[PDB]
Assembly symmetry: D3
Homo-oligomer: 248 residues x 6
């Protein structure tokens, strides 16, 4: 039986899986665009980004509730022109609800970071940061086995900054999305031998090389979508509601 | 005519660089400025009911004196959702001239200064806000003009007696903050503006500045009506007012 | 009827309205004064430490001047004009000036409680986290609420009738200036009717959009109501001549 | 020649007041600038491996494009300790020209502009960073030049089709921040720079700005080689490159 | 008799208020009516309590001080500041200050020092106009002797290096010996004459080889303030006394 | 002994979490802490001449009371260059216990308190800085103690007469800021500290607080000598003093 749900029921279910208070300070989570949460929902769409093409695709596929991992806006605005105008207009004239679980989806049990920790079967995993982001533990295997898993399940040509030789049973840190800032490299260099994340840039590569931290950039997109598919299939398994993905 | 032409006409009258630092002037809501405009609506406030009225009257371009938002947001729920939904669904352009319309020649403050026929008028503040000059008449005559053209029942804080030919300061809108009262007490005998509150009243009494609160609304709408008729004289376009 | 030392008056007042109830940054306590052993024959109560109030205190032989509002919110480092004239009257007459501001707003039976008890609010709770204001159910009609306002607070209150109000509605009260834009947004989530003072245009417009009915009974009157209660509380307990200056 | 003479030559080419606000340009590590210099080393980064190589090759004056530290410190441990110790015990001078070398005439951004032979080039930002102008040719010809001279396999974010004689913006190093994307989208059809990340890619696609990431390293090293060759041509001094 | 506002325009002609550095609390400290007639003007370095007590005792009407009454703003009046204001207000004594505008102006406190040492072709030491620097045409010992004879009998000398004749001398009246000041002046001079030396600044001067002479905050200012006092006495028909010097 | 063992011993005496907020305590300069230590040097200040003397005397672990840098830097030239070059090329560890050594039991302030035999001593400030208590004797006896054990000719600001059995506050180093004078005036009759300047002197006189400046150096070196003898008594290690 596939059935219609009210928006508020979907939201309460998502927030049971990924409570809002797990979100780190200042993260723009929750209702992005919407008014009435009693709205009946026929079709739930899941996306990584609330991009313009995702929102156009939501309109085309008759999506009533659009879930995105990333918030619509990180920085507040007071004028509505260009792209943000095009996006809000499509959402508002179609009364499409836009809702986000961001770092709360990263941090929660079986969330985006746990999905990575489980894929690599990390021994005794711990949160990588104090705020609960990322996971770290021992990878029980060779660097090459880790690489093959990375290539088979996450991304084919990952960038490897092979700063040093890596022995079997090494400490592996994972962080879905963008974990490769300079300050993150410095912090993680103390906690792990290998750091798997996304969005490598030049100064961070150089730093990783100086510190002997092996960094694997399997992209921002892929390291999050892996967990986001698990999330989608979790929702499909529990809600009798048509659910589609839009940018994955 | 097209929206960008209405906008260039307004910005010729009241240039954007006249706005004080940080004022959210210009385009509030809109994308295509080549859009043809049949009906222009003028409002003091971009309130929910004003926006509902614009939609109802087939307004294509909504001009307001106050910006839609002072403080930036990153979620769209409740009232702002309702306002944006009406504007966006109908492609109604929302555009504002705020302090640039206060400050410019023949703008809202010049309108008050001209109503009272101020002798040798000067900007009240360095940034160009407000006007001050001599009111060539008695206090009571100043009051009669106020009641006849701006507001029938102004609040008068009669901190001292006012002799004929006094210095009168005007500031359309909200000019009655505590720091304004202190500043204007040095420059004028009588201060005509809006939105008086308790502490500013006490302060004016202490300083001996006579303050006349003819309301925020009326002291702006007077000049805003002049602006509307100016637009009507120059633009071949249906132009209506929505909250005045 | 007898004379008291200033510090005895201060201790009685701070027993009623403890300083630690004051919100962050509030300039409460001693405003102007040195020696607190000074004997006090006449205590004067005022809402504002205005220039005319201070002149009246001098004229009536007030030794201890209590005001609800602090003399200064913003600190200064030059003493001219009005503040010069005021300090000179206080110092030349050695008049002690002391204030209870938000600690008097927040304390039990203080300015906000006075309003809550006046409207007989059912199960009142603090309106804001810092303890400012009160909110609860008004057991009656909107009309009965307005009459109480007109009978006890202010004759012609401004009413922003943003929506219809049914009997037994949620009423929020806040003595003084509670009508800022951010207050309207916050209180709109908590009550049907908001009674406070000092309404200005943008707040009025905002209240209308949110459906919050706003009643402006003025800054002065919504505080003086409780300030009269305070004055009577002092008179019942202190053997001392006590007058009011701006009410 | 003395270190101060090398410094004066570089600063004549790329004056320090051209550096943007807060940029840590000039002398990074050094004391005596009267010291005579036998071997000058040029590097993009003052990395630990670059500094070690400098010692091994007997470099006494080490020039880098990037400053040693952006953020100030007050403790000396770990990597920064190893770097300072090698520089200090060997009295190797470390000197940087950063954004002043990006902005100056024939500096890193001009070199890109000249490579693409931009028609009527202007600075991309007000502060002088980047260049923008017309590429007199097809997008494919533009790609071919990029592949031959800068990076064999650039990432192309093909947000839209690009017509011949399009507007090309170049910015050596990292010019692909989100605010940079939004800004450059109004000035150019194609944005050539380095260090593309996910949110910026998405933004570029939404805006129709075609972005070509030829890497941070390669888009700087191209001009840094021209700078090296200019030094070699004018200074009677051994000059080597260390990380390129 | 002359009015208070006339004394103020006279002082401000000598030392214009726009010369004061950003944020300096110069001008009218305590007072209302400036049409007030003034019989007796008192000059002081500090508006201290005892200076203000002395002002009342001597019938001073206009109290001029180099230092402002308050640097940091207040919003309560108790203890010492209550006592100072009470004396000024019940006696209607006007309190007025010229602070850095008096340090910086032509023939002001820093120029007074520069002239004492006959500095060859002097320039302002800081961009904002504070201090003076130039060549002292003589030996270090001759410089010390002038210091001992005219400013302070026994200055603290931090002798960080030997000093050759015809050296560069920087002077700054009052407190010029902060750590950031030592670093700055070390680039500009061989010898630094000022007041209020403390331990970290002393160490820093030794490291940089900057010779520092602390002839005290008080003396390096009172020297010029006496010249200022005689300047007023020569031009104003008015009884003028000094209170803490 | 290894460097880390010396550090663990010092931190047992003066725990790092006792330091006031932001105080730059701990490792200033050093990399390898398993290093065995040949000679420990103690200094008040990590000055240039102190560090030179350490090199000359073969000190490999240099302890100072004052941190090397309070304000972080990002360029390394002049004096700081000369200092780091010596520490780094000789691999000399530089470590500081600053306010944690001021506050800890038998630390610098306790040493003063015990010297004057303060009756029933308390911390002067909430954060644990300084000590205050009753001096069981005359002002003159206090002065005689000050002259014999701390500094001959201390500067005395004799703001009022001092009766026997007065309250004495002590603070090793710089305790004579204006806000400290105001604070201590409420708590003691006499304030013993260092680094007096003019405005503080005037302020003390206004408040009637008697202030004795026995100098920054000496009021700390007294306790620092006790600390040195404590280390010498407990560690099988050569220990010398460098600036005292
Ligand atoms: Fe992400
Ligand atoms: Fe307005
Ligand atoms: Fe109030
Ligand atoms: Fe770069
Ligand atoms: Fe001074
Ligand atoms: Fe110290």
């Amino acid at each position: 039986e596939v059935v219609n749900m009210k928006a508020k029921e979907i939201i309460e279910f998502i927030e049971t899986f990924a409570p809002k208070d797990l979100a780190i300070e200042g993260d723009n989570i929750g209702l992005q665009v919407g008014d009435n949460l009693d709205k009946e929902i026929k079709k739930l769409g899941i996306a990584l980004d609330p991009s313009l093409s995702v929102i156009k695709k939501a309109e085309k596929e008759g999506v009533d509730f659009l879930f995105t991992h990333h918030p619509l806006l990180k920085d507040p605005i007071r004028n509505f022109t260009g792209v943000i105008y095009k996006k809000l207009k499509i959402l508002m004239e179609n009364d499409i609800i836009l809702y986000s679980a961001h770092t709360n989806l990263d941090i929660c049990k079986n969330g985006l970071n746990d999905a990575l920790a489980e894929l690599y079967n990390l021994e005794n995993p711990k949160p990588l940061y104090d705020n609960g982001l990322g996971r770290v533990g021992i990878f029980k295997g060779s660097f090459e086995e880790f690489l093959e898993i990375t290539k088979k399940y996450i991304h084919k040509n990952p960038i490897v900054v092979k700063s040093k030789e890596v022995d079997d049973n090494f400490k592996l840190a994972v962080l879905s999305g963008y974990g490769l800032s300079q300050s993150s490299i410095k912090y993680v260099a103390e906690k792990a031998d290998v750091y798997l994340s996304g969005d490598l840039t030049h100064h961070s590569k150089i730093l990783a090389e100086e510190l002997g931290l092996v960094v694997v950039d399997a992209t921002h997109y892929s390291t999050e979508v892996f967990g986001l598919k698990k999330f989608k299939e979790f929702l499909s398994s529990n809600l009798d509601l048509e659910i589609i993905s839009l940018d994955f």
